[PDB]
Amino acid sequence: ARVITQGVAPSNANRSSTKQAEWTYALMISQSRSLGVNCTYCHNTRQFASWREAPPARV
Amino acid sequence: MHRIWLMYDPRRVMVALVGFLAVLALVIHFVLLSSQRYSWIENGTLGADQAPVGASAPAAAAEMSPLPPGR
Amino acid sequence: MHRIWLMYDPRRVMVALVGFLAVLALVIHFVLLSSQRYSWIENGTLGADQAPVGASAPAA
Amino acid sequence: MHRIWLMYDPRRVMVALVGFLAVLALVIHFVLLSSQRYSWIENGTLGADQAPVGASAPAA
Amino acid sequence: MHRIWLMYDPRRVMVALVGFLAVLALVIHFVLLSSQRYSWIENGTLGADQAPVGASAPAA
Amino acid sequence: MHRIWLMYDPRRVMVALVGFLAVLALVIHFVLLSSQRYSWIENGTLGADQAPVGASAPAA
Amino acid sequence: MHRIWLMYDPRRVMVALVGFLAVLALVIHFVLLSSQRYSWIENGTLGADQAPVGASAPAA
Amino acid sequence: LEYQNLFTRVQVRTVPEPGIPIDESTGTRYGTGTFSYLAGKFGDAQIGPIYLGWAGVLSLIFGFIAIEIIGLNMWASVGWDPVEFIRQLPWLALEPPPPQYGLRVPPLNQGGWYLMAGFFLTVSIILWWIRIYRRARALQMGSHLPWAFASAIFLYSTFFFQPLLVGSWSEMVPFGIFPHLDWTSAFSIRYGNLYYNPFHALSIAFLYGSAVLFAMHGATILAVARMGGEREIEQITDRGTAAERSMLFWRWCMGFNATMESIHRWAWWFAVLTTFTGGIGILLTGTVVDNWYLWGVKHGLVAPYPAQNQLTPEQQDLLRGRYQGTAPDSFPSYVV
Amino acid sequence: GSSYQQAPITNQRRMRGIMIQSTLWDMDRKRSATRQRYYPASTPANQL
Amino acid sequence: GMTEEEARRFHGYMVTGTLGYVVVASVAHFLAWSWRPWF
Amino acid sequence: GMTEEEARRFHGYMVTGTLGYVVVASVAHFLAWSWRPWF
Amino acid sequence: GMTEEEARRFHGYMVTGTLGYVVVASVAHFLAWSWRPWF
Amino acid sequence: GMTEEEARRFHGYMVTGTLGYVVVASVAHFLAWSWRPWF
Amino acid sequence: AMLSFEKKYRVRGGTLIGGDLFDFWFGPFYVGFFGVTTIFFVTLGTLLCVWGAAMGPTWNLWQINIAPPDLKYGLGLAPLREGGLWQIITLCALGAFGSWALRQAEIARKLGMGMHIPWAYGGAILAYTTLVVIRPFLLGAWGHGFPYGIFSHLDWVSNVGYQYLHFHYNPAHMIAVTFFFTNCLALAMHGSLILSVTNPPKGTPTGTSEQENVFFRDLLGYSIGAIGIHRLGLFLAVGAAVWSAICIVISGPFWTQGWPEWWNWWLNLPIWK
Amino acid sequence: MMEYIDGAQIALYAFWLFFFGLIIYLRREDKREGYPLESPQGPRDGWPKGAPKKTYVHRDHG
Amino acid sequence: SVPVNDGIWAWYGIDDDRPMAAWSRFHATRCVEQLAINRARVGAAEWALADVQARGIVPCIAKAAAHLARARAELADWEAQGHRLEAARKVTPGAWTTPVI
Ligand SMILES: CCCCCCCCCCCCCC(=O)OC[C@H](COP(=O)(O)OCC(O)COP(=O)(O)OC[C@@H](COC(=O)CCCCCCCCCCCCC)OC(=O)CCCCCCCCCCCCC)OC(=O)CCCCCCCCCCCCC
Ligand SMILES: CCCCCCCCCCCCCC(=O)OC[C@H](COP(=O)(O)OCC(O)COP(=O)(O)OC[C@@H](COC(=O)CCCCCCCCCCCCC)OC(=O)CCCCCCCCCCCCC)OC(=O)CCCCCCCCCCCCC
Ligand code: BCL
Ligand SMILES: CC[C@H]1c2cc3[nH]c4c(c3C)C(=O)[C@H](C(=O)OC)c4c3nc(cc4[nH]c(cc(n2)[C@@H]1C)c(C(C)=O)c4C)[C@@H](C)[C@@H]3CCC(=O)OC/C=C(\C)CCC[C@H](C)CCC[C@H](C)CCCC(C)C
Ligand SMILES: *[C@H]1O[C@H](CO)[C@@H](O[C@@H]2O[C@@H](C)[C@H](O)[C@@H](O)[C@H]2O)[C@H](O)[C@@H]1O[C@H]1O[C@H](C(=O)O)[C@@H](O[C@H]2O[C@H](CO)[C@@H](O)[C@H](O)[C@H]2NC(C)=O)[C@H](OC(C)=O)[C@H]1OC(C)=O
Ligand SMILES: COC(C)(C)C/C=C/C(C)=C/C=C/C(C=O)=C/C=C/C(C)=C/C=C/C=C(C)/C=C/C=C(\C)CC/C=C(C)/C=C/C=C(\C)C(=O)O
Ligand SMILES: COC(C)(C)C/C=C/C(C)=C/C=C/C(C=O)=C/C=C/C(C)=C/C=C/C=C(C)/C=C/C=C(\C)CC/C=C(C)/C=C/C=C(\C)C(=O)O
Ligand SMILES: COC(C)(C)C/C=C/C(C)=C/C=C/C(C=O)=C/C=C/C(C)=C/C=C/C=C(C)/C=C/C=C(\C)CC/C=C(C)/C=C/C=C(\C)C(=O)O
Ligand SMILES: COC(C)(C)C/C=C/C(C)=C/C=C/C(C)=C/C=C/C(C)=C/C=C\C=C(C)\C=C\C=C(C)\C=C\C=C(C)\C=C\CC(C)(C)OC
Ligand SMILES: CCCCCCCCCCCCO[C@@H]1O[C@H](CO)[C@@H](O[C@H]2O[C@H](CO)[C@@H](O)[C@H](O)[C@H]2O)[C@H](O)[C@H]1O
Ligand SMILES: CCCCCCCCCCCCO[C@@H]1O[C@H](CO)[C@@H](O[C@H]2O[C@H](CO)[C@@H](O)[C@H](O)[C@H]2O)[C@H](O)[C@H]1O
Ligand SMILES: CCCCCCCCCCCCO[C@@H]1O[C@H](CO)[C@@H](O[C@H]2O[C@H](CO)[C@@H](O)[C@H](O)[C@H]2O)[C@H](O)[C@H]1O
Ligand SMILES: [Fe+3]
């Protein structure tokens, strides 16, 4: 489900579409509602990709 | 029938007509170019017996993928 | 019955009429082209015996 | 009865009528076209006994 | 009772009346069309015993 | 009593009243229609013993 | 035929024509350059027997 | 209680309504002036005749067909049901092509109508620009308005060029009320939080500054409208006490002032720079920078917070996922 | 995927918007609106 | 606006036009009911 | 605007124009019917 | 405005150009049809 | 505005310009066809 | 220094508080009592911001971050190094902004102007007060305020939005956005029109209100007129801030679910339920 | 191969140089009225020095 | 539309300009106010006509005469109300001691 690049510049490693980010966003709304929580329960939304900035519940 | 040009200014009708005809022409070419059977830029060299038929299904291709590789 | 043109300015009526017919013609062609049975640009060469029908396969 | 046309300008009424009937007629056709039973572009060639019917009694 | 038409312009009343009846009629038809029991375009051919009924008390 | 129709314009108060009753009646019907007990378009044919009742007090 | 220039000012029509031809030419080049068969900046040196061709009917 | 100039109690009407003054060729004024009492209570009353010319007429034909294609695809997507067309309207979309097509022409249902609607809309917008430009010249006015409108068109065009530069039409904005907001949010997700794009931050500063300025300037002119301050052209050519007092208010408040003319230059640039800096920020996204937060870490924008979690080395290998791939095109049985 | 198999037409969504399953369909459960989400069955006439 | 004679004249067309249209709609419903009855 | 004998002249063209259009559309339908009937 | 003489002159060119254009389009369809028929 | 003889002089260049453009486009199309035919 | 016409305007009077005591200028600036309180709060607040930077991890301008307290402190003052400093700076901010609006009222009264500018600024103060006073009070802890830091407050905006899953679906936010966008369009048209009549192409005479009116009427179909466009610009710019205040105060205190599921009422209208 | 310098940063300083140029231009335009300033030490111009006062050609008659 | 003088309150049926033959204190108050205004409005309209006749500008004289005639017609409408209220004031016991007109 990952779509975010782990570097500053664009690269062959990630060619995700904005449509694929829409699909992950759909999936994540489903998970949030399934628990009765919002995105900040598992993310710091300044970086959805980040694990260090996110609570342990993301693991 | 020529009295239609008294009722409408031909200088205005000619602009509306050229507009209508250009949009219609462009619509039909873009419609055909998006079809399987008539996408002549890619498949125009095919004979009439081997151009696609019946490709009317709405999801002929996958909706979700990465972009094509950067090379 | 031509006295309807005394009641309405034909110069406005013909613009309204032509405008209406063009949009109606466009809508109907788009509805048909969106259908399975009458998507004629892909399936126009099919005979009527093999054109799509909006029913499921028999014996359920 | 005709004195109703002294109360209202028939040029305004007859336009309002044509507008109403045109939109109403379109609505009805599209309400039918989007049903299962009257989706006549896909299924109009089905016989009346073959045409769909909505679900009925609730239990086995 | 006709004195009411001295108190009000009858052409204003007829416009307000006819518009009220039109909207009210449409609202009722769309309410019914959205219901299960009276979805008559899909299920109008069902007999009165076959037509849907909303859920009862459990009475278990 | 009747001198109130000197203090207020009859022609005007009647419109205000008739508009108020129209709004009140429609609100009450729509409140009932969205209940369970009185969703009469779906369940109106149920007998009074058989119609829904809101959940009771009994609890552990 | 020349009287068209009495009806339309050629200092307008010339500019409109040049603009139309510019955008049309740019569109057609862009459509071709985006295609597989005619992406000539990358594949222009391929011979005609080597250039891409779009699919076929899958007629066995 | 003091008269606030927010509402006009007494309008006046002229039996004739003003017409267009000059240059009637290649195009003509449609209609004739009429008065609106409500518009005449907000502002000036004449709902006017209107000008199109060749460019305006063609702009409407192209733009009508674009909107017609958008609406008919929306209506087809709920199966032509006219009740669902209204009920679901803000969720409906005409959607870009699938990503694996890149820049190739896609199938008609799968984004081929999208590109066609986008083409006619773009041509329509350019013809409307030509209309505005020609009309400014014909009224013997400066071209300040068409260059202001060109800045908006610049931002709009980046929603074509950035998808072109990343190489796929699938990255374009869907035509739809909520869908284009879904795209807007997902674009910031894909590219790693657009708040750290510095041209996005600049565009916001100019968007806010445009609201600051029109609030300040709108309030300033109403505060001196009791002295004819709203007759701004007269105040520019023949400075009255209304212009002097509005200059002194801002000088005494914040230590510097504009003039009655040059305040309109501040206004013009703040509006124009909103969409111009915005467009640059889009064009850099996915082409030069692919994760703006990491660009912000590199350049020192990102405030440090204490860690909320720490990964062990084997979790750093376990908790990496996969980049998202293709949807499954089969319905597996698990019977064996 | 190495190649694409097209789904049965009754499994193909009419709505191409990516998020509509979360933003609408998880709260909308009107029967007629539900039925419209997928293309209906479609068969060559000589196979009826 | 109109005279009483003009209203009288127009009303004859309007009533006849309306009832004519309703007659054509009646045949359309006859054809539709024969093809696929709704009750 | 329109004169009586100006309106009557215009009406003649409108009738033959309408009829000519309806004829072409009728041929268009019967041709489409022969190709792929909808009932 | 136009004179009727001027309108008649314009109508001659307009009808001729329209029918000429339709004839050219008729040939373009003959070529398209013989390349790849659509029915 | 142009006079009729001023217009008829302009028309001669316009036709020649159009013919020249179409000729260049024809040679371009024939080069393109010989390089990579589209039918 | 003074503008060439300024001196005759520099009279006494028009103050709300203090009378002649502070009724004087300092360079271009009018002082007044609310000038004195402005400088006090500005200075105290700014130096406490510098103190916040000093005890934080960096002097990098973009990264300085003076954060509110933990939610556990509720409506009390927290320890100063644990968010109590943010609370003291917030009081200075409220004092500085209020003093600024009242000083604007004194200036306007001295010039015989209407009170439009102070009240227009009140729209912005309302939004700030909503963000740091009203919404945190309704939620029961000052820690719901945003942090003072050029980019850390954007992290707060991001996270508050995603507390409601898809903040674009907030209906008051859609209105607020529409006002902000419509304001910027209207500002570009008003600026362009005045400049284009006052700065026509070389050798053209100066334009007129009639030309401006004609052109505008071809843009929108109707004449707004001179006072009308300034009413519109004020309505749009201040309405944007008021609807912003509404959109954030309903998020949390009144609506707690995701914003997309608020739209369920539209799907269930009885005509099409 | 420059690690720190990247196109987004280069663009941003390009903008800053334009923007500070623009503020100067606008502050020159803002001084076409009311300047030079009166002062007990004689005239003052501020900075930048203002553009000169415009004279406006009126519509010749109408 | 709302009438000018009762405005928003006309939505609630307060409408004191309407022709009233019974005695009513509210209509009497209104009529005394509107008589004074309309007498002054006639006085202004005939001053305006005299001024424009002195200037001799015929189309302005024509309009000023039309305006004066209209102003007189409105004053007569209020004087009719004043008299019919005067008739009622004499007989309805609770009514004012001061005349209405
Ligand atoms: C990269 C993204 C691009 C993406 C593509 C983006 C393209 C955007 C282009 C926008 C251009 C706007 C320019 C403009 O508005 O000028 C004002 C003028 C209206 O004013 P006017 O007063 O009414 O004009 C008539 C006349 O009075 C003007 O006289 P003036 O004295 O002012 O001079 C203006 C002329 C100068 O004259 C000429 O250039 C003509 C000379 C003809 C010589 C012929 C040769 C004979 C001698 C042989 C030797 C000759 C030796 C030379 O110039 C102009 O200002 C217009 C210049 C042409 C504009 C072309 C626009 C297309 C540009 C494409 C660029 C592609 C990219 C490179 O209007 C126009 O020019 C119209 C522009 C053309 C629009 C055509 C309509 C588009 C339809 C598209 C349909 C496409 C699908 C079929
Ligand atoms: C984010 C995107 C959108 C961001 C959007 C930001 C927009 C900001 C626009 C406004 C900025 C300019 C403000 C202004 O003009 O104030 C008047 C003052 C003095 O000139 P004057 O008014 O014509 O003449 C009066 C003076 O000569 C004699 O007056 P008096 O004898 O009565 O009073 C004593 C003197 C002492 O002088 C000073 O104290 C001046 C100190 C100015 C420091 C602040 C500069 C800010 C520059 C920001 C632009 C940029 C700098 C990099 O005069 C005064 O007391 C005047 C007090 C004026 C107080 C103005 C405070 C403005 C603070 C704005 C802070 C903005 C922060 C963003 O002007 C100046 O001192 C020079 C300003 C020159 C324009 C800035 C151009 C910068 C270009 C890049 C550097 C160029 C290097 C050569
Ligand atoms: C989760 C969402 C993301 C986000 C994602 C984006 C994206 C993605 C974009 C922006 C962009 C912008 N964002 Mg941001 N944005 C977020 C948070 C914010 C916040 C905030 C308080 O949090 C604010 C104030 C802003 C503010 C802004 C603006 C400054 C800027 C748009 C300028 C403009 O005028 O656009 C409005 C103006 C236009 C769109 C121009 C249109 C002009 C054309 C010509 C009009 C055509 C009309 C046509 C004729 C008719 C159409 C008919 C119909 C088709 C039927 N964003 C977060 C971080 N933002 C844009 C930008 O520039 O980014 C750098 C952009 O593309
Ligand atoms: C500086 C930045 C800001 C800005 C500026 C700006 N926008 C502008 C302008 C300016 C200065 C204009 O001059 C221009 C304008 O016209 O303003 C009124 C415009 C404009 N800004 C627009 C919108 C807009 N601006 C936006 C934003 C902004 N614009 C920025 C905030 C947004 C946002 C925030 O998303 C939008 C949606 C438009 C209203 C307008 C450009 C109009 C245009 O190009 O229209 C083209 C035509 C059509 C789309 C077709 C309409 C068809 C109709 C359905 C009628 C059909 C009739 C008939 C059936 C056909 C014809 C038949 C013939 C025979 C006659
Ligand atoms: C049906 O087929 C599709 C297409 O393969 C499967 O989806 C794949 O897996 C998803 C992770 C991904 O989203 C999608 O892009 C695609 O890669 C889908 O899950 C179904 O899978 C079953 O059928 C597969 C098939 O393609 O036939 C089959 O795959 C295996 O067999 C084929 C044919 O022999 C061979 O080409 C494949 O390499 C092989 N794949 C693997 C990973 O072994 C699946 O079998 C297995 C073990 O995966 C089927 O899956 C199941 C559980 O039955
Ligand atoms: C969800 O529910 C859903 C599914 C929606 C279902 C529910 C549907 C509902 C609620 C339907 C309601 C329908 C309805 C009312 O409400 C329907 C009412 C319909 C009516 C009244 C139709 C009237 C038609 C009249 C016509 C066509 C007139 C033609 C006139 C002609 C031709 C002559 C013109 C004049 C001439 C020539 C003379 C000029 C002479 C002159 C000038 C002279 O001589 O001078
Ligand atoms: C998917 O399917 C859905 C959509 C769901 C299904 C539903 C569909 C629905 C509801 C359809 C409704 C259709 C409809 C309803 O009425 C359709 C009505 C159609 C009509 C009336 C067409 C009329 C056409 C008339 C024409 C073309 C006339 C041409 C005239 C010409 C050329 C001559 C012009 C004049 C001249 C030359 C004289 C000048 C002389 C002068 C000036 C002189 O002499 O002075
Ligand atoms: C989606 O579909 C896709 C994929 C896009 C496919 C479909 C594409 C389609 C539908 C294409 C349509 C193409 C088309 C349709 O009409 C194309 C029509 C093209 C035309 C008409 C071209 C005409 C060119 C004419 C030119 C260049 C003239 C030049 C003239 C010159 C140089 C002389 C100037 C005058 C002089 C020097 C004299 C001055 C004297 C004076 C002043 C004096 O003497 O006074
Ligand atoms: C019967 O008539 C009906 C009832 C259908 C009429 C009603 C219609 C309705 C209801 C329409 C509703 C429309 C709505 C709600 C539209 C919403 C639109 C929104 C909100 C759009 C927002 C953003 C869209 C953007 C930014 C799109 C940008 C697209 C661009 C720039 C596309 C450019 C494409 C180009 C230049 C294509 C070129 C063609 C190729 C590439 C092939 O060749 C050069
Ligand atoms: C497709 C739907 C619409 C179809 C409408 C047509 C329906 C077919 C029946 C038409 C029958 C016409 O029948 C009759 O015609 C005459 C023609 O003068 C009309 O007569 C009317 O006009 C004449 C002459 O202008 C007047 O003198 C007369 O007083 C007036 O009634 C009648 O009012 C109408 O009743
Ligand atoms: C001519 C533009 C259209 C070309 C279309 C393709 C070729 C087909 C037409 C071949 C004949 C040339 O076209 C023919 O030109 C003559 C004049 O020369 C036009 O004649 C027209 O104008 C002349 C005056 O110039 C009038 O007297 C005449 O009544 C009128 O019809 C004809 O209407 C047209 O039919
Ligand atoms: C898909 C298309 C989307 C298009 C969206 C269009 C949305 C348009 C919504 C318009 C809503 C107007 O709603 C109106 O807003 C203004 C904003 O000032 C509110 O007004 C409010 O602010 C003003 C200041 O401006 C105060 O003086 C006033 O006391 C206060 O109530 C009104 O009380 C409210 O009635
Ligand atoms: Fe202004």
TrEMBL record, chain A:
Binds 4 heme groups per subunit. Signal peptide: none annotated. Heme c 4 binds at residues 2-4, 28, 39, 42-43. Heme 3 binds at residues 28, 39, 42-43. Heme c 3 binds at residue 41. The reaction center of purple bacteria contains a tightly bound cytochrome molecule which re-reduces the photo oxidized primary electron donor. This is Photosynthetic reaction center cytochrome c subunit. It comes from Gemmatimonas phototrophica. The chain holds residues 178 to 236 of 354 of the full protein.
UniProtKB/TrEMBL annotation, chain B:
Bacteriochlorophyll a 1 binds at residues 29, 40. The modification N-formylmethionine is found at residue 1. Signal peptide: none annotated. GO terms for biological process: photosynthesis, light reaction. Keywords: Antenna complex, Bacteriochlorophyll, Cell membrane, Chlorophyll, Chromophore, Light-harvesting polypeptide, Magnesium, Membrane, Metal-binding, Transmembrane, Transmembrane helix. GO terms for molecular function: bacteriochlorophyll binding; metal ion binding. Antenna complexes are light-harvesting systems, which transfer the excitation energy to the reaction centers. This is Antenna complex alpha/beta subunit domain-containing protein.
UniProtKB/TrEMBL annotation, chain O:
The modification N-formylmethionine is found at residue 1. GO terms for biological process: photosynthesis, light reaction. Residues 34-62 are annotated as: Disordered. The keyword Plastid does not apply. GO terms for cellular component: plasma membrane light-harvesting complex. Keywords: Membrane, Transmembrane, Transmembrane helix. It comes from the Bacteria. Residues 2-62 form the Photosynthetic reaction centre H subunit N-terminal domain. The chain crosses the membrane at residues 6-26. InterPro entries: Photo_RC_H_N, Photo_RC_H_N_sf. This is Photosynthetic reaction centre H subunit N-terminal domain-containing protein. It comes from Gemmatimonas phototrophica.
UniProtKB/TrEMBL annotation, chain P:
Keywords: Coiled coil. It comes from the Bacteria. Residues 61-88 form a coiled coil. This is Uncharacterized protein. It comes from Gemmatimonas phototrophica. The chain holds residues 23 to 123 of 125 of the full protein.
